[PDB]
Amino acid sequence: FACKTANGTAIPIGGGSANVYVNLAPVVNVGQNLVVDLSTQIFCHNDYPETITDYVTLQRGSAYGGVLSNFSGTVKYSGSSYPFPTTSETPRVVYNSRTDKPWPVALYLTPVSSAGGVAIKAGSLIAVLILRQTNNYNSDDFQFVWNIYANNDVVVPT
Amino acid sequence: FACKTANGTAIPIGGGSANVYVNLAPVVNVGQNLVVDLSTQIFCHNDYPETITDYVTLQRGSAYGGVLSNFSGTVKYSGSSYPFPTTSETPRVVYNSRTDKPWPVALYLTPVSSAGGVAIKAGSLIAVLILRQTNNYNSDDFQFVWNIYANNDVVVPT
Amino acid sequence: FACKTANGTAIPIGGGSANVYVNLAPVVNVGQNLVVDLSTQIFCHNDYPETITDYVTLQRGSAYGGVLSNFSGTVKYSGSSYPFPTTSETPRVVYNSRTDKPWPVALYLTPVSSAGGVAIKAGSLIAVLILRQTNNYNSDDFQFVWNIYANNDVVVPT
Amino acid sequence: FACKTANGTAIPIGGGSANVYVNLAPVVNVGQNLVVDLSTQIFCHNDYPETITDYVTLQRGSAYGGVLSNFSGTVKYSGSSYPFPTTSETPRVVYNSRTDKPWPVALYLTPVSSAGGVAIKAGSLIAVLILRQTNNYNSDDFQFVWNIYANNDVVVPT
Numbered sequence: 001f002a003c004k005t006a007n008g009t010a011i012p013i014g015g016g017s018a019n020v021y022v023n024l025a026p027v028v029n030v031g032q033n034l035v036v037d038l039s040t041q042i043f044c045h046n047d048y049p050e051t052i053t054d055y056v057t058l059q060r061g062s063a064y065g066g067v068l069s070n071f072s073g074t075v076k077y078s079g080s081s082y083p084f085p086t087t088s089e090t091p092r093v094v095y096n097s098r099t100d101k102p103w104p105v106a107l108y109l110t111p112v113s114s115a116g117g118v119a120i121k122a123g124s125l126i127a128v129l130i131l132r133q134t135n136n137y138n139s140d141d142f143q144f145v146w147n148i149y150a151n152n153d154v155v156v157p158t
Numbered sequence: 159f160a161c162k163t164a165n166g167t168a169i170p171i172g173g174g175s176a177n178v179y180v181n182l183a184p185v186v187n188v189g190q191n192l193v194v195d196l197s198t199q200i201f202c203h204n205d206y207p208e209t210i211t212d213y214v215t216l217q218r219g220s221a222y223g224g225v226l227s228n229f230s231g232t233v234k235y236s237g238s239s240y241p242f243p244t245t246s247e248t249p250r251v252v253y254n255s256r257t258d259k260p261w262p263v264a265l266y267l268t269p270v271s272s273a274g275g276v277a278i279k280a281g282s283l284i285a286v287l288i289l290r291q292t293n294n295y296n297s298d299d300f301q302f303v304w305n306i307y308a309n310n311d312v313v314v315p316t
Numbered sequence: 317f318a319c320k321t322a323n324g325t326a327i328p329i330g331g332g333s334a335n336v337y338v339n340l341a342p343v344v345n346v347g348q349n350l351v352v353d354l355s356t357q358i359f360c361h362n363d364y365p366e367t368i369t370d371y372v373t374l375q376r377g378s379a380y381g382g383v384l385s386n387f388s389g390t391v392k393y394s395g396s397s398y399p400f401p402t403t404s405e406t407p408r409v410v411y412n413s414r415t416d417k418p419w420p421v422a423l424y425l426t427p428v429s430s431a432g433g434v435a436i437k438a439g440s441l442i443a444v445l446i447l448r449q450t451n452n453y454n455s456d457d458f459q460f461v462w463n464i465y466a467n468n469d470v471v472v473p474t
Numbered sequence: 475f476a477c478k479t480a481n482g483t484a485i486p487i488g489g490g491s492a493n494v495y496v497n498l499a500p501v502v503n504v505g506q507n508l509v510v511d512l513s514t515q516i517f518c519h520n521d522y523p524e525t526i527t528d529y530v531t532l533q534r535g536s537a538y539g540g541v542l543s544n545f546s547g548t549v550k551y552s553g554s555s556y557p558f559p560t561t562s563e564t565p566r567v568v569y570n571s572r573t574d575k576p577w578p579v580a581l582y583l584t585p586v587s588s589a590g591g592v593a594i595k596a597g598s599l600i601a602v603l604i605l606r607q608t609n610n611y612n613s614d615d616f617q618f619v620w621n622i623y624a625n626n627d628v629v630v631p632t
């Protein structure tokens with residue numbers, strides 16, 4: 001089981017970490033969501049599907065910097081919604097093919113009333129999402145740690 | 159502050175996510191209304207009411223599946239109506255007692271003019287409603303995320 | 317292989333005909349589409365999937381009455397678009413399960429410039445769609461003929 | 475009157491449907507433009523120009539897949555720009571010769587601010603464009619339905 005990003009780095013069999021940059025709407029008002037869909041960016045696959053079933057959870061999502069300070073959020077994982085930062089590990093998604101399948105994770109972030117001017121800085125760490133992978137074969141229990149960075153500034157109108 | 163559901167589950171202190179399975183009218187004609195009343199499904203209470211006031215909003219309500227594609231309508235939160243899907247956080251409702259109070263949320267849904275046959279599938283996700291809880295005591299700001307599923311097919315007859 | 321409608325009649329193994337009523341937007345201007353999605357109304361299944369593959373086409377779509385006189389159209393079948401009335405039989409869709417699967421057919425109908433007042437009458441025949449079913453097993457070649465009737469009047473504003 | 479495509483197919487007299495497979499820029503940044511020029515792909519001619527004038531509109535253009543969700547923009551039909559997806563039939567272009575003339579349709583597409591990673595998948599449907607042909611001779615009113623597919627992944631970098 002391994003993962004890669006749309007146009008860049010991989011995390012190999014056994015887990016590891018990678019950095020992922022995301023495009024954010026440059027302007028967001030209170031009562032609006034920024035939607036950050038990682039499923040167009042993070043893809044995984046099962047290496048031995050005919051003999052092994054891999055199980056993949058969102059083990060933990062965490063907020064950093066301007067998202068931690070200036071936004072509240074929810075996370076959508078495989079069709080179900082959760083608070084963001086997360087409060088528990090999700091149910092598992094099954095990976096059963098050598099063909100890349102997106103990791104179905106999307107953040108929905110909304111500015112709190114204090115947000116104003118640059119609520120998120122360009123290039124800054126906004127989130128960490130931890131993909132936990134297991135199987136029906138052996139004791140493998142691996143973390144794929146995704147560090148989420150903002151491409152651009154996000155301004156909340158004052 | 160925590161919440162429970164009718165013959166099911168709980169989201170404990172600090173928030174979290176639950177699934178809510180709701181019975182729907184099997185038949186709703188164009189022009190007719192489908193009512194999804196969560197006030198009979200979702201109940202919350204204040205844990206230290208002698209000392210704390212709890213504040214509770216519908217932060218966001220979103221439509222999914224057949225409700226998203228085949229219906230339009232409103233959300234009534236404690237007496238006032240709003241568009242659904244929502245565009246802003248509602249006013250607060252106070253929880254000031256240890257005894258279960260309904261979450262006063264109801265969806266008022268009516269078929270699009272072109273809908274017919276099976277407009278909602280049994281077992282499908284129809285809505286996500288986020289309960290945001292704060293207080294007059296500390297910095298607690300918790301999301302209680304309700305994933306609302308149809309128990310049955312809803313048919314718009316033709 | 318057989319088919320049924322959402323809340324009514326069946327066409328049995330061997331083919332046959334049925335009448336299907338559809339809800340139409342009561343008011344349509346030039347440059348707007350009426351969208352008639354039969355996939356919420358017509359469902360089919362394979363009776364012996366473990367041993368037989370069924371193939372299902374839209375063999376022909378035809379317009380009648382007010383649609384023939386007052387609208388031009390396209391038909392969407394399993395993700396691809398065609399003129400309506402059709403000019404040939406579609407590629408086939410595979411049915412490989414005893415579980416009901418919709419027949420993925422949707423009409424997109426737009427008023428011609430002459431349309432005015434009641435362009436479609438309530439209860440009138442508007443379309444015939446012919447489902448042709450074959451298999452990889454024997455010589456079975458069957459027609460499921462769907463007669464499409466308007467529920468309500470459709471008015472084109474003058 | 476009929477139409478042909480670059481190294482492919484034809485829709486003959488009387489209209490019909492074809493698939494068009496188009497090469498796309500592999501990378502389009504937010505702020506940048508993706509151009510889908512069908513003028514190099516779709517060619518039509520008049521069969522009896524000594525005697526007949528053929529009239530040709532873009533009757534409707536619709537977006538699908540990643541183009542629908544991840545892009546916004548316009549359609550340029552013979553020099554004038556319009557919203558895409560479309561809201562009205564365009565002016566006519568005349569075909570008055572037996573020699574292939576391009577269908578002068580081009581999509582001008584730009585990423586939504588929140589798009590990143592794989593915004594269009596290879597092999598996926600991105601658009602349907604309906605060519606409506608009439609004449610100055612008889613009642614012929616024919617639809618030529620072009621189903622437009624991406625040949626490659628289009629990545630919005632982050």
Ligand SMILES: CC(=O)N[C@@H]1[C@@H](O)[C@H](O[C@@H]2O[C@H](CO)[C@@H](O[C@@H]3O[C@H](CO[C@H]4O[C@H](CO)[C@@H](O)[C@H](O)[C@@H]4O)[C@@H](O)[C@H](O[C@H]4O[C@H](CO)[C@@H](O)[C@H](O)[C@@H]4O)[C@@H]3O)[C@H](O)[C@H]2NC(C)=O)[C@@H](CO)O[C@H]1O
Nearest residue numbers: 001002013014045046047048050051052054134135137140
């Ligand atoms: C069809 C059938 O019944 N045939 C079986 C054979 O499959 C079986 O041989 C074992 O096959 C399993 C997979 O089914 C192998 O498990 C994977 O091993 C790789 C690599 O490690 C081994 O293989 C290497 C060569 O490829 C060798 O160099 C090395 O010595 C090892 O033997 C791991 O990378 C895999 O784990 C990754 O992918 C899986 C699936 O996505 C994830 O769950 C993991 O977390 C991880 O990401 C597998 O573990 C196994 O190596 C084969 N042999 C044994 C005994 O381990 C054969 C027994 O030999 O029996 C036949 O009947």
Ligand SMILES: CC(=O)N[C@@H]1[C@@H](O)[C@H](O[C@@H]2O[C@H](CO)[C@@H](O[C@@H]3O[C@H](CO[C@H]4O[C@H](CO)[C@@H](O)[C@H](O)[C@@H]4O)[C@@H](O)[C@H](O[C@H]4O[C@H](CO)[C@@H](O)[C@H](O)[C@@H]4O)[C@@H]3O)[C@H](O)[C@H]2NC(C)=O)[C@@H](CO)O[C@H]1O
Nearest residue numbers: 159160171172203204205206207209210212292293295298
């Ligand atoms: C009458 C009067 O004013 N007397 C006050 C005392 O109240 C005060 O002592 C504080 O009392 C408050 C209750 O009013 C306590 O607050 C609740 O604590 C529980 C449990 O917290 C314990 O366990 C936690 C681990 O989960 C620890 O982190 C924590 O330190 C505690 O040990 C919380 O669960 C409550 O919060 C929930 O319920 C409320 C009400 O529904 C919601 O609003 C919240 O969102 C949340 O769901 C309360 O926070 C508090 O612990 C007591 N101590 C203090 C000050 O922190 C006393 C101070 O000594 O002063 C007297 O005069």
Ligand SMILES: CC(=O)N[C@@H]1[C@@H](O)[C@H](O[C@@H]2O[C@H](CO)[C@@H](O[C@@H]3O[C@H](CO[C@H]4O[C@H](CO)[C@@H](O)[C@H](O)[C@@H]4O)[C@@H](O)[C@H](O[C@H]4O[C@H](CO)[C@@H](O)[C@H](O)[C@@H]4O)[C@@H]3O)[C@H](O)[C@H]2NC(C)=O)[C@@H](CO)O[C@H]1O
Nearest residue numbers: 317318329330361362363364366367368370450451453456
């Ligand atoms: C797993 C395996 O290899 N086992 C096979 C057996 O399947 C096989 O027995 C034949 O099985 C096939 C299906 O695989 C049968 O075909 C269907 O027949 C029914 C009904 O007609 C028969 O069965 C009736 C009882 O159910 C009998 O009363 C009757 O005498 C017939 O024998 C048809 O309705 C089916 O056709 C419908 O459904 C299919 C699939 O959706 C459509 O394609 C058709 O258009 C139509 O809608 C099938 O034709 C078949 O009847 C079984 N027997 C034979 C010889 O015909 C067995 C051979 O006996 O071999 C085993 O190895």
Ligand SMILES: CC(=O)N[C@@H]1[C@@H](O)[C@H](O[C@@H]2O[C@H](CO)[C@@H](O[C@@H]3O[C@H](CO[C@H]4O[C@H](CO)[C@@H](O)[C@H](O)[C@@H]4O)[C@@H](O)[C@H](O[C@H]4O[C@H](CO)[C@@H](O)[C@H](O)[C@@H]4O)[C@@H]3O)[C@H](O)[C@H]2NC(C)=O)[C@@H](CO)O[C@H]1O
Nearest residue numbers: 475476487488519520521522523525526528608609611614
């Ligand atoms: C110089 C002059 O004015 N002389 C006229 C003659 O034109 C006229 O005879 C008619 O000539 C026209 C061409 O101008 C003919 O029209 C084309 O016919 C073809 C083929 O149609 C034949 O086959 C059909 C089967 O598919 C039969 O149904 C039909 O009866 C014919 O036998 C069509 O394919 C053409 O239509 C296509 O191309 C045009 C041009 O691009 C498009 O606009 C259309 O949408 C379509 O794609 C034409 O229709 C016509 O057949 C001749 N006869 C008549 C009147 O019908 C002559 C009359 O006798 O008068 C002279 O003065």
Ligand code: NI
Nearest residue numbers: 002045046047
């Ligand atoms: Ni691999």
Ligand code: NI
Nearest residue numbers: 160203204205
């Ligand atoms: Ni309690």
Ligand code: NI
Nearest residue numbers: 318361362363
């Ligand atoms: Ni059956």
Ligand code: NI
Nearest residue numbers: 476519520521
């Ligand atoms: Ni020709």
